[PDB]
Amino acid sequence: KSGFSFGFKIPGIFELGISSQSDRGKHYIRRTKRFSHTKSVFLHARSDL
Amino acid sequence: YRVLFYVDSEKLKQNDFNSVEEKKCKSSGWHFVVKFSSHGCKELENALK
């Protein structure tokens, strides 16, 4: 935010006044998420009689 | 009659959390008809899990 004002007057009346204001703001956000799960079950059976 | 059974149970758990937040704002104004004003802030926030 920025603002400037200037005024000058001198009688011989004459009066002059100038004001300037400029405001600018920017917001940026980002969100990333990842989830991975692996489940493996290996069962082997062998029987001889 | 022989019997031999072996069980090898293993469980591992690991969790890490880190968060960093930094915020800085600076504003300066000087007037001597002359008027000047400046205002600006900055904010930063980050978190990971």
Ligand SMILES: *[C@@H]1O[C@H](CO)[C@@H](O[C@@H]2O[C@H](CO)[C@@H](O)[C@H](O)[C@H]2NC(C)=O)[C@H](O)[C@H]1NC(C)=O
């Ligand atoms: C954005 O940031 C927010 C900060 O509040 C996150 O919100 C929480 O984050 C914690 C971190 O582990 C989680 O346990 C909570 O479940 C979150 N809550 C909600 C309502 O989301 C958020 O995870 C971040 N990421 C996004 C929103 O995508």
